[PDB]
Amino acid sequence: ASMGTLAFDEYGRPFLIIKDQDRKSRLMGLEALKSHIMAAKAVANTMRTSLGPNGLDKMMVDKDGDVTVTNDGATILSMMDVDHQIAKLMVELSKSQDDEIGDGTTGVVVLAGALLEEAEQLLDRGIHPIRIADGYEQAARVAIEHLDKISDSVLVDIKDTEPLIQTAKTTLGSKVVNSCHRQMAEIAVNAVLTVADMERRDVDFELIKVEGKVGGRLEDTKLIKGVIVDKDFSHPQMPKKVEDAKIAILTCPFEPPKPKTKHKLDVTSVEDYKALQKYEKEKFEEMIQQIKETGANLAICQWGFDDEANHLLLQNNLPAVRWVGGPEIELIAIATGGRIVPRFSELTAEKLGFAGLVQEISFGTTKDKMLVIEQCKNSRAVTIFIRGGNKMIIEEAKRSLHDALCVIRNLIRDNRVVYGGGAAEISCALAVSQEADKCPTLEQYAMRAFADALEVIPMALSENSGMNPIQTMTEVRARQVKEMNPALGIDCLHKGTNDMKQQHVIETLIGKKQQISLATQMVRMILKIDDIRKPGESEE
Amino acid sequence: LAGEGISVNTGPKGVINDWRRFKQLETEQREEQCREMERLIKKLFLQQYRKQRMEEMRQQLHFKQVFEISGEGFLDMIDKEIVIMVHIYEDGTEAMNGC
Amino acid sequence: DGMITETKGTVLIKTAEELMNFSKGEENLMDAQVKAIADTGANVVVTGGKVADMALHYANKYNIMLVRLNSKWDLRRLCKTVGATALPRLTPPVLEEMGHCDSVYLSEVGDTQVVVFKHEKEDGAISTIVLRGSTDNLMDDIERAVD
């Protein structure tokens, strides 16, 4: 059923059609569909245990032996070294969900796996896969419309940030940073709200700087309404703290000028040598005096400088920082409200940035120094400083905070929300079943399979929390049918109530819609492949 | 079958003599193979030269022989002490040898 | 493009004013060259070498069609079929060296972008047969039959 074809003609003559056909392998028909469904089921079942607050982490190891402990679905799938093409398709689906939304990267894989698992039985009952895909698409449209129906709006005002904090907390519940749960939610909400165009426009993540330094505690993570820099003051004897600093951002090294065009300065006499050395000294003194004339209390360069300039800066009581990166230069200019000046001739008082406090920070017995610029007037750039007991939880906190920032960004883009814990999935499955009950029979099986696939998320949440999946899901669905309330989910945290509105389990409507869509088209694409042509060489 | 954290500790301590005796020969073999594979695999009327004839009968005016290299001979001929041409053949070879 | 020296060209700058004025003067000179070319009524330019970016800009400004022919055989055949003389410098062409064609345009045949030098008279020095087919080998065999 593989290795292409082998006929060697009816007359015994050689029959070579495709290059290297003797080692190439092919799979056709229902067998290929079954293999793809099994591979996707394996991937989904592997990812299933990392769902919900009680979900467990995966410890990834790369080629070089570096270890990553994480719960993010997209990160887990990216780290995996898979060879199956369908596995790569699921990895790309997770990456797409991360790119568009940033949250729900694990729900999409589970939903796709459930959809393909149901499609396996549907195929075994003798239905064309295209019919299954069409039924899945129709059920997905119905579910998306129902999600739009039961969605609820929240306020995205800076004055009242409680719903935003609740949404960030719901996002962060599954991650390991739940020990500082409300703290991380608060800092993420404040970070997103600080750097944002108010008219529902984009939130540029380049204005959010995320850095992690080992040591301290996870609770020591804080939001700095300014810029924190890995550099320090150039001269060791410069003061370690500047107050009410008038920043002077520069991109010109404090060196004698050098034309870009290749050049040669001819020295033809002793007078030429004296003039050259006097010119060098005068250039140094002139640049330092020009820096001083604007009244700046601190100068930040980008390309470093040499000993004479350093000592002149120290002598005039001007703390300075050198070799600051371009992105850091831009962030400092944005935060302090100052302009970037390319040479000392154009520097003036109006182009000086203002910072309330510039300080050098020590980190215990490590000799490592980092500069913090904060207490800005109207800082439009923000940075997040993460501490922890090891670099691994630092990276996990980084990605968890990124997920929270993405969730608040989605809330800014659209404020309509739905209640999680499987309540939305259960309501969508109920709506899909109701629609199927009023539909011609042929696509009824596809719609009911789609509903059963939607039902997996509450099952996974209940199983991860130790409860019986089928019994709890059936009870919740019956309660939802009895009293009209689509906010009843799976009590993962055992708070004693199934009402997710009271439990404040909130997730973005756009996230759920993207989950359902991306899963539907990915399953349609997988179902439409009936043939595989692999080289089969298995080369080194 | 557990305890994968063996921490072999002083186990290899008692075998450094034999391990290093084997490792010296292993390193020598690896060096010989590298030197062998350094060449191989890597890349495995004026126009008629009127001066060719004059160079021909002025070259004959001198007769010794080229040195015949012993696997380590190739190693230690180039390892120590200029442009060197080395001929590879097994017994057109005679013509270029005379050249 | 503006012709360069053959031994070695070095722009020797000794004062600031020369450095400022060099690029502007070069651009103005080549603008004058292209405008002199265009003032003779020429509207199609065929070159056998590379095309300078600034030269392309100034040819676009004066509404001049640029066609590049890499092979010298194609250049010679085009000169024969149009009646022009392959000039060796950027001097504007004299009246007898100016080629004439009934219509020159850019067109697409199948999925291939081609430039057509079309005559209306049933004469000329060179004629072209356009061969269509469903297979490259079939067109090659038809070309052998044509030969």
Next chain:
Amino acid sequence: ASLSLAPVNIFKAGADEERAETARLTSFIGAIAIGDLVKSTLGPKGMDKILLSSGRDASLMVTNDGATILKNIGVDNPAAKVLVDMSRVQDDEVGDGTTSVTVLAAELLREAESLIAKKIHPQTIIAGWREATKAAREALLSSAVDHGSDEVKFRQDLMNIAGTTLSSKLLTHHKDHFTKLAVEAVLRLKGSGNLEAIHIIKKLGGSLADSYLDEGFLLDKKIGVNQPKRIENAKILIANTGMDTDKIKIFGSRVRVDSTAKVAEIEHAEKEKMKEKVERILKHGINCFINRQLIYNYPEQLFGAAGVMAIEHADFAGVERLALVTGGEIASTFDHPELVKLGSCKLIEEVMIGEDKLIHFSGVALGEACTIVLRGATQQILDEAERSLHDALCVLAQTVKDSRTVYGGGCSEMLMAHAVTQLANRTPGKEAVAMESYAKALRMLPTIIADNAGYDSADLVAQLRAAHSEGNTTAGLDMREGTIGDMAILGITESFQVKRQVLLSAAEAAEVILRVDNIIKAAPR
């Protein structure tokens, strides 16, 4: 179905995955192996380890430090890597407590393995451990005592803390001498946290008791040929200039003339420029000149002709330490002598230490920089002495920064576990069992401390538990004989920051390791 146990194969060649039971087994085995390896080097009666490198150089290292043991080992178990990184971060944050935090994490993970065998969900264990960590942290914070107000009491606390830190290392042979040395060296920093201001110089030969803290400063550099070798009432100028074939920084400059006489004139002009720079330096009125970079033949000849000692090639650390100890300003321009402060010291001379000669600065003005000469019989002894002294200095600096102190000898762990147990017997569910396991690990810490000494660890730990039960909150392991006693009287003091960091880091690492239920490894490179 799993990825590995499926009829289709979904992985590259060499990649694999381990599911819940197998991943937990591997993680627990690795963590317990690390804990068992690092332990037995804990407490006053702990032993050292030999780290025999298998590389070409075959470096030999003898150490009691847990962090150095854990970092210099080939580790393939990912959980073992987590614990190693924990120990490294523990060392980075504070000098001491690497072995303690590693052992605590290993014991916590062993208890977690037992609880999982008892059919308990890891999330319940994690929640119980979070509650226990909160309770223990609150108890330790309430138990802390501050003595920063009283100078004599603070100095006594510093002495006790340094002695406790050095009690487990090779320096315990001469504990009083090294304790006084480290305390004086830290107090000479005058509150500055830069441990790089303290230089540890290791010179082979002599006894370990021959080590001393110099009253001034020591430099391992040389002096010019024709310069004085001894200066009294020195006025020191510290510089960071080139003074070596000093080139004008116009990189495009060149000399283009039509005769060699002009070339000679330009060379004389360059020499005159260097001479004028030396004259400007001498205008400061100095006796000793220290430059970070090299000093070439002509400037050093000019200095010798002026009777000024010139020390060259003192690196960034060297010039910083001289500036700290003498009060001078590192200068790179010499056009405003009145704006540059010159370092001052009573005497500069050359001392003969071992077979090497060093420059000795005596009677320094400020002295906020120290040099410690370590003498030993072997290179391994010197390295281990330096590491132990570094740990002591780090802990003393931390105590200076934060004067809150707790009682060692297992007292802090005993009170932590007492609070944890009091919380555990007040909570229903298996979280009570998880908190009891947390308390068991906290007990196991001083249990290992007592076991390392060959004492009756079980009986001593039971006595400590009882004593903390009645209300004796200062009882601990009296290691002199093998009894229990008051650590307030015995002066077994330890920094509160170190214990808090140990507790929190161990709990955090145990929590992050316990959350793992699947280990997936890519194909090795």
Next chain:
Amino acid sequence: EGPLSVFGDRSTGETIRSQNVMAAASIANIVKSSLGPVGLDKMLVDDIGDVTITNDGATILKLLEVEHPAAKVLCEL
């Protein structure tokens, strides 16, 4: 390879039918040139130089080395 778990190759559908028809056509074409009065005999060499010139189909199909079992079915027929 797959969940069937049998140590051997498996062919299903149009592939096996085409293989069987190809084998039958090969057997037919072997002897198709020796039918009717205008047929011609064949040499058969037995790998040791032994020659068997024949026109009978049964002899040709008996002396031939046949591996495909449908071809064996036709030879037995």
Next chain:
Amino acid sequence: GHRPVLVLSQNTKRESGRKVQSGNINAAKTIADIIRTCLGPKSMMKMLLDPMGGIVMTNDGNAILREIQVQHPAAKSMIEISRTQDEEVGDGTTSV
């Protein structure tokens, strides 16, 4: 693995068409030309080297033909007819 599936066994060659007839006729022509010069009263003798080490110096056509080994079956048939002529009548072996 996966040894290839095919109708006939390996090393089973098959030629057909004008090539077979041409090859047979050229093989017969070669057999004839081998002993063409050994006919008539002025025939020249030939030396045959027996694989066992003997020497067969003969002028008879059948003796020459039966002492050589051939691969082409047409040559085998020609040698067989030479032997048949030798056995039936005793002479005429090269003429036939």
Next chain:
Amino acid sequence: TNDGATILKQMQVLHPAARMLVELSKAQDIEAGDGTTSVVIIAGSLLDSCTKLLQKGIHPTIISESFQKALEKGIEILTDMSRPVELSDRETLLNSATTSLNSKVVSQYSSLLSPMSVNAVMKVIDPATATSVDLRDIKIVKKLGGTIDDCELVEGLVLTQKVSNSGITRVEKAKIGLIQFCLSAPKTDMDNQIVVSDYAQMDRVLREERAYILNLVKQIKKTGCNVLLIQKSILRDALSDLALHFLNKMKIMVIKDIEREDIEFICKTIGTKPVAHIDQFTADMLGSAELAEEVNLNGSGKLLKITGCASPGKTVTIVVRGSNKLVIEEAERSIHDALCVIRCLVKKRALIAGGGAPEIELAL
């Protein structure tokens, strides 16, 4: 070799305990200079005793404390056996040096080497108000040829560098000068080129280069210098052929390729202050010497000796001669052992009997 530290270092031992004993021998050599074999033997014997101690059920911590107590008691006992010694007593120094050399191959040549070592130490330190000896002031030069009987105690300095002035040797009443600049064509640190656009410019270029070299040589000669030492230069040619020709015509020996590391030793030995620019090259920066002669060692090489210097420095040089290289290296090691013994006499001036008497007294 017979030196314990050298034997231990030469052979790789591969065992951490053995490597630690190697380090112990190295430390003993650093602190004392001899007794490197005795300390290793002591450590081995102590650990051998620890074997039976541990087999008796004794924890390896009571053993350490008891060994510390025994060490303190033994130090007190050894101090009791000590005898005060003064550096003015030459007999005790000679006896110590002879005892040090008794165990080496140069024991036969002890009547020559022990006074040599005593004089070498005494000539580089102040006999009073001295607490240490810098052995780097005693230069050891190993020249193949001859026998150990040919060892010398040159009080000046010997240079292995040859005389570039082939034809002038043995300058008497030498006025040595040490320079650190180059006697070649002018060259600036800033890169330089000379552009010629006329034949007269060509003539002027070479004429002025010759004149510059001649002026440099004349400035050197005017100071009365007759022996010139030139520091090794790699950036540009230190001594051009033209400069060498002028110096030879001025009757001055030229010694080039002087190592930068030997400048301090040369200046201490002679009294020459280094000169890095011809402007500061004056007569007062020259080191007067009685004789500066290059001698040959019976065809085994050439050595330049500067013997007899006004205001001599506190440095001495010892020339070691021998039949083959191995005995020369062992003689150098033995002389170093003797010098280290005299240094141990210098600091903590206390003397005890040898012959195993202190060890047996410690045991009892």
Next chain:
Amino acid sequence: GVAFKKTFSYAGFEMQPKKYHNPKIALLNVELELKAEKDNAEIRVHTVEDYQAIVDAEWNILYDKLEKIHHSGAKVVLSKLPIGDVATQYFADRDMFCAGRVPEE
């Protein structure tokens, strides 16, 4: 209209406004950064005043190009050739949008 991905913005790009309500677009094929005038151009001076004049001439050439672009009235600037950090900051100071390395298509 037309849409394309952002192409490796330099430092100071984030300070430019990202929305205009009637922009004029300066489609350019120009390298707006400090560089040698030509790859075969060599500057020969023998006076420090001439050195400073040459440096100021390079800066003035760049600023003259930038000033012509700004005074053209355009608000959005797109260039096939690279646009340097100096030009990016210059356009940011004028509330102008810049983007280099824009593909030919």
